[PDB]
């Protein structure tokens, strides 16, 4: 009616900013005092993977910790054997402008998408001996930016038209939709048991969704600019986000607010990706000045650098058993560190 | 060798994937790639016919040279997230309508787009080809519709020669890296097939200055 934007809606945001302050009695970086540091952490390039001809944009590990897939702007999708650095499959894509890839947990399927607005599914196990397309999922209106399997039949996608969506692979229809954001959604990450997931958008916020219902549960607001990457903590009760203002942050789901900020005065470039190591004591982030820093997560001291690359570090990932770390870059190489 | 019989036949499979990868990266380096931009009102659609959801490609061979043109205006997202995918095209083509000067908010809408792409940090080394379409409809509109409705400072003749010539310097002054980039202006006819003959001549100029700068001989 009259003035209704004023009184009621801007009041409930003043009830939330005062309830988060009624539970923040102490800060993380005080109680994490008088514990041992982790000391310097040098690692070394164990493998190097050659064969792409253009920039590499995405990568994802298989669940056995030995195979992996990668995508690049030359229209190829390669599956690698990382112990003996052999190529297992090479897949040609219809279009060349690809921005994400994922591996099915069973190991039977892989997914792909980009500036064509489609998510393509590929069957790896056939009676004929080659890899053929199995499904195409249409309906988004902007470029696809991320996707993740839940099992052999379900998959979630985030899109540049400000929306996320849940799909059914038997048919080709999206069964649920997710709307609240007001900018382009850039990334998403699934809970360890796959009941919840989070996403971050260019409106500088992150959201917690429920999968079976389809409703937002919490919103988080700390950054000054866009959010590029996001990841869950192994416990399942915190997550970290990396933004375009050269900072990372830690959020707590049950305290409902922020715990730490990971920054430094000599670092003034954006962040492309982020990941946690097993047990969650280290936070790896890969930045836009060609490096990859390693942070102590409880304390806020940076505890290492790994500087083998020659151009922008676009993606990284840590394996399930915790053995190695991979990075892809805009010079077309992949490297395994340990 | 310490490898098994099956370990050796997996190495041989891999070296034959390696050979089809090289065969594909050589057959794709024989084509020039071009991004097509411009605040889209009229001209951009006819120049494709002149040469014959997400992203739109097109092919055409002319005189032993193969091209791929990319139209991108059908996206409607934040342009500052995906535009860096096009780092490393050979050139950019840019379309403008000369018949949008006194309709002057629109002519200054094009000068707003030409200023942001020409000064990106991703396109520091990329030259620009520039078009100016609809040179018929601009013939008489200078007569009935005088200028200074599009540019207040222009205090000179409405003779249609200083007019088109004055619109030109207003764009090329927008180039702020006079050393690492050139502009190539041309006035599109729409009946002659000289349109594709100009794109050929400018593109073979862009490549020789790249080679001569790769060996240090510049």
């Amino acid at each position: 009616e009259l003035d209704q934007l004023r009184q009621e809606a801007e009041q409930l945001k003043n009830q939330i900013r005062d309830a988060r302050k009624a539970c923040a009695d102490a800060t993380l970086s005080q109680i994490t005092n008088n514990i041992d540091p982790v000391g310097r952490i040098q690692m070394r390039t164990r493998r190097t993977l050659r064969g792409h001809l253009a920039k590499i944009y995405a990568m994802h590990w298989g669940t056995d910790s030995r195979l992996l897939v990668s995508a690049s702007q030359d229209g190829k999708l390669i599956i690698w054997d990382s112990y003996t650095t052999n190529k297992v499959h090479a897949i040609p894509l219809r279009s060349s402008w690809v921005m994400t890839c994922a591996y099915a947990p069973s190991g039977n399927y892989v997914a792909c998408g980009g500036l064509d607005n489609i998510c393509s599914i590929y069957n790896l196990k056939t009676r004929e001996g080659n890899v053929r397309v199995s499904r195409e999922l249409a309906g988004h209106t902007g470029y696809l930016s991320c996707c993740r399997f839940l099992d052999d039949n379900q998959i979630v996608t985030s899109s540049g038209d400000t929306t996320c969506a849940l799909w059914d692979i038997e048919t080709g229809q999206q069964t649920t939709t997710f709307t609240g954001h007001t900018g382009d959604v850039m990334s998403l990450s699934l809970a360890p048991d796959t009941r919840l997931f989070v996403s971050g958008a260019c409106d500088a916020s992150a959201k917690l969704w429920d999968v079976r219902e389809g409703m937002c549960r919490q919103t988080f607001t700390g950054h000054e600019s866009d959010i590029n990457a996001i990841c869950f903590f192994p416990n399942g009760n915190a997550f970290a986000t990396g933004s375009d203002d050269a900072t990372c942050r830690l959020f707590d789901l049950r305290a409902d607010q922020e715990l730490m900020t990971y920054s430094h005065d000599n670092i003034i470039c954006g962040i492309t990706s982020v990941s946690f190591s097993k047990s969650g004591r280290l936070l790896l982030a890969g930045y836009d000045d060609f490096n990859c820093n390693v942070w102590d997560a409880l304390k806020a001291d940076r505890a290492g650098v790994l500087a083998g690359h020659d151009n922008r570090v676009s993606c990284l990932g840590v394996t399930d058993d915790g053995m190695a770390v991979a990075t892809g870059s805009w010079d077309s190489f992949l490297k395994i560190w340990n | 060798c310490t490898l098994s019989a099956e370990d050796k036949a997996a190495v041989e499979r891999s070296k034959m994937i390696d050979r089809n990868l090289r065969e594909d990266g050589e057959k794709a380096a024989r084509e020039v790639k071009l991004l097509l931009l411009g605040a889209g009102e009229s001209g951009k659609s006819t120049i494709v016919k002149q040469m014959k959801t997400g992203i739109v490609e097109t092919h055409f061979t002319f005189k032993d040279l193969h091209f791929k043109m990319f139209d991108v205006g059908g996206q409607r997202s934040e342009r500052k997230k995906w535009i860096h995918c096009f780092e490393g095209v050979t050139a950019i083509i840019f379309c403008v309508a000369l018949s949008d000067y006194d309709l002057m908010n629109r002519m200054h809408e094009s000068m707003k787009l030409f200023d942001s792409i020409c000064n990106n940090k991703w396109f520091t080394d990329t030259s620009i080809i520039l078009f100016l379409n609809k040179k018929d409809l601009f013939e008489e509109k200078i007569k009935k519709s005088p200028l200074t409705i599009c540019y207040p400072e222009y205090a000179g003749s409405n003779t249609y020669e200083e007019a088109a010539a004055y619109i030109q310097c207003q764009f090329e002054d927008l180039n702020k890296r006079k050393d690492t980039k050139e502009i190539y202006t041309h006035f599109t006819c729409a009946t002659d097939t000289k349109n594709v003959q100009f794109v050929f001549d400018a593109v073979t100029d862009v490549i020789i200055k790249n080679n001569l700068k790769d060996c240090g001989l510049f």
């Epitope: 052999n86 297992v88 080659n130 | 098994s4 099956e6 997996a10």
Partner: single-chain antibody, 232 residues
């Protein structure tokens, strides 16, 4: 998927024939190929191998300078030229397809066979049973023994199990070891270590009747074991 071979017939000692096989239903150029032979009333014997891309070829010492194997990809066909045939070459000849990468299953599809009747350092595999009678629903075991250990330093042991029913071609049951081929009931299983292996069937149906073979794939030449029949 099917493989159909032709040629064969009757030949005098010293003549020559030419065999072929027609592939249909799969990506022929991606698979390596084998020829395997079986004389009247005895077991299986490996003959020759040509890899995908024609870059590698191996032969068995019995037929080394007398036979030649080749392939024609755009036609999808496989050849075997024979010269100076002797009476030890009477047999039925099969055609087998196999692909090699991390996690694949070699030796999975076998042809129907063609007969040729001519007129008138190696690992040894020993399986010492024959004609063991059993009733349905019972538990039966089989074993063969190697003269060298098949466990390689990378972790794998290379032992396979095939099955041949009266009137048909062999089928695969277990690859490298304890791995079950697709389309096979779960009541089979394979176990062992080093130089002693075993194949177990839990409770039989009326179609698990025939002879059973074992094979090493640790190094060329490839060698089979003799057969272990099962009569009900």
């Amino acid at each position: 998927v099917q493989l159909v071979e032709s040629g064969g017939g009757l030949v005098q000692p010293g003549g020559s024939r030419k065999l072929s096989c027609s592939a249909s239903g799969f990506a022929f150029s991606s698979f390596g190929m084998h020829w395997v032979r079986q004389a009247p009333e005895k077991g299986l014997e490996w003959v020759a191998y040509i890899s995908s891309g024609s870059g590698t070829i191996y032969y068995a010492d019995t037929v080394k300078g007398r036979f030649t194997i080749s392939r024609d990809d755009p036609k999808n066909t496989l050849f075997l030229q024979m010269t100076s045939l002797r009476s030890e070459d009477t047999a039925m000849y099969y055609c087998v397809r196999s692909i090699y990468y991390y996690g694949s299953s070699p030796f999975d599809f076998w042809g129907q066979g063609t007969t040729l009747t001519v007129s008138s350092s190696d690992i040894v595999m020993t399986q010492a049973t024959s004609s063991v009678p059993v009733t349905p629903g019972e538990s039966v075991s089989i074993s063969c023994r190697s003269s060298k250990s098949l466990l390689h330093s990378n972790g794998n042991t290379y032992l396979y199990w095939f099955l041949q029913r009266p009137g048909q071609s062999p089928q695969l049951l277990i690859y490298r070891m304890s791995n079950l081929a697709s389309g096979v009931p779960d009541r089979f299983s394979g176990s062992g270590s080093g130089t002693a292996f075993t194949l177990t069937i839990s409770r039989l149906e009326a179609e698990d009747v025939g002879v059973y073979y074992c094979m090493q794939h640790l190094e060329y030449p490839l060698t089979f074991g003799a057969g272990t029949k099962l009569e009900l």
